[PDB]
């Protein structure tokens, strides 16, 4: 299967520049009709910003034309987005996407996973990870809730898994909130059988790539 | 630019019901016998997924309950029978001319029967207290509808302005929501009080539910 994987997201200062890449696997980049960047500001809609077709012609949305460049490296099977003079309006998830050889070309059947660019003057800060221990006050029937609090980090995002991805049922990872301090906080909880607390280990795996902070936190009854 | 306006911007529908979303373009997207309108489905945390291209063609692998119609400036996406996995924001997109533009998005949720939350409360950890701050967390699990009210009380004083909350997307497994609320206090304030309570009001509860603990015990 063709897979598109973006890299280059993270924190950029206002007036700085971003450089994103999309590595294409399972498919030769020279065979695509077009390769594209489309972005989505937090909680807003989708904006196409740039395309490069198979003959190398480029095109840009006039909303950003003048400070954006798209390019390809066929030998690395990768294409790139460069933008400069960044402003708060440019904070967004940036997606790469493939156009079609058919039916007018400019619709997008294959997309990457998106990478978040945050334009801000603030500093990177990695999170503290605290346990939300199961107890009598987090039990309903023979079900217990436990979790991890991922507190005081910047910028987004953080990922959380449980037991290295082996535990997915009953997991709820909540959207982060922005505190008045300017730092994010989020929680991830899981409900599990009360009878498993003595015998099953529960570890939350936190990763804040912007600060290269990885934490594995074992959560147990207090 | 061609501007696309979707209607409605959000809807809630019983499971299995027919759902219709419309898109109106500021100028025609017709060309030579085809209509260059496309539809996408975006689930939380995911890239959009193409459903319909050239106004009425179903993308490979997409379930046949999705269909598109229309021409000129007026287009419809129909879900013939809404399924629990269909919670998403749906976008139209014209490919008639650059810049390619998308509608603003229509949010779709499944209207299921009322379900009251399970409520759980977590005191601050001793690890956090070491650092000078105390976070108290209240979890409302697996409830419907999304509207819920959480009130924090500390020794029976209503707390206002020192908590934040967050809600998950609708879970397609049972069409429910969950919600987390965090009360933040200084360690010194936390150690000055005894009873910590989160009081929950919701359509599924005939009276409010309070979960509480006593600091220490």
Author numbering:
A (entry chain H): 1 to 222
B (entry chain L): 1 to 217
Article excerpt on this structure:
Immunoglobulin E (IgE) plays a central role in the allergic response, in which cross-linking of allergen by Fc∊RI-bound IgE triggers mast cell and basophil degranulation and the release of inflammatory mediators.
The structures reported here were the result of unsuccessful crystallization trials of the complex between FabXol and an unconstrained Fc∊3-4 molecule, but similar crystals were also grown from crystallization trials of FabXol in complex with IgE-Fc. In the first interface, with an area of ∼395 Å2, residues from all three heavy-chain CDRs contact VL and Cκ domain framework residues from a symmetry-related molecule; namely, the VL domain AB, C′′D and EF loops, and the Cκ domain DE loop. The second interface, with an area of ∼324 Å2, includes an extensive network of hydrogen bonds between an edge β-strand from the Cγ1 domain (β-strand G) and a short segment of β-strand structure in the Cκ domain CD loop from a symmetry-related molecule.
